[PDB]
Amino acid sequence: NLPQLEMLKNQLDQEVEFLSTSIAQLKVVQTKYVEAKDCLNVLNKSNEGKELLVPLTSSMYVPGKLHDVEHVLIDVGTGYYVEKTAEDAKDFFKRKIDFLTKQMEKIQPALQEKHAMKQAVMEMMSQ
Amino acid sequence: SAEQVIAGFNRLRQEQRGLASKAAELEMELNEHSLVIDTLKEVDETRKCYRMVGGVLVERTVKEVLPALENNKEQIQKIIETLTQQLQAKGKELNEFREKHNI
């Protein structure tokens, strides 16, 4: 009874934290998908011609001039070049936002399943 | 009874770990304030200095970038002493309330 449950409640604590860390990773993945749409919102609205400071590399910025706001690269596949317009790019970002949400949604009751089972072992040891 | 003493000392130790995350989080930033203010003074400051952080560039000069560098370094070293005194005062307070309760 009780020595089995004291080993059992400690195992489920890792299984919560292993899944919850995977939730924390996929939020970072959909973070840049929100971030790429909001960069794209300024792009069509402003105009071509405005000066931008973009990273040449890490912590080093190169200036430049802006042209062709209605044609953008989308990085999908295994790392593949896909040229799209800016209008279809917003739809595919929000599609990937709901996709990464869907990746966390299948974990989410199972994340709560490992938490509620551990609490029930805490109750069964208490009862 | 001796259980109120030995458990209250466990309460003061857990606040030492609650003290632990906040002061060292600021302490990592003051050394970044150390390395930045030295490279700016060695390099040319006649051309205009900006302030670049994540998400915003405000077009500035050297005379507006320079004082906040010395300001934000001095504010950190005060708070890491301040956060030490407050949480260690909290460990003294919970011990005497446990001794006056269960007597």
């Binding site: 790429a36 590399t57 430049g64 690269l73 990085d75 | 970044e32």
Partner: protein, 132 residues
Amino acid sequence: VLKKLDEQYQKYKFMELNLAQKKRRLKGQIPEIKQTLEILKYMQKKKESTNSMETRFLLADNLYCKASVPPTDKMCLWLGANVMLEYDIDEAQALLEKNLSTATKNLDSLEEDLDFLRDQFTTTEVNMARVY
């Protein structure tokens, strides 16, 4: 006797973890300074590489906008902590090469000395145990 051998086994293993905390911070510095030199030294400027070129800007991690480049000849590098200064090529080049050479030697010279600082810690704890 194996009993004196067994105490030195555990005191050697625990001091290995304190070394790995210091080497990985030395490890994390190296690729970041590595990206600064090789991207600069191949493009070398809009000026040095002979006017207007092509570009596909980094707006985000997956969204790149294609355009024609032509900027003016400066590079606004990023120092950190509410500081940006505009720079040129010659100021940005010789600085990062020095940070390139040290970050290897910061990893190389310490990783031997950490291996003997572990050996100081394991040797110290066993001589006091055998005496008192």
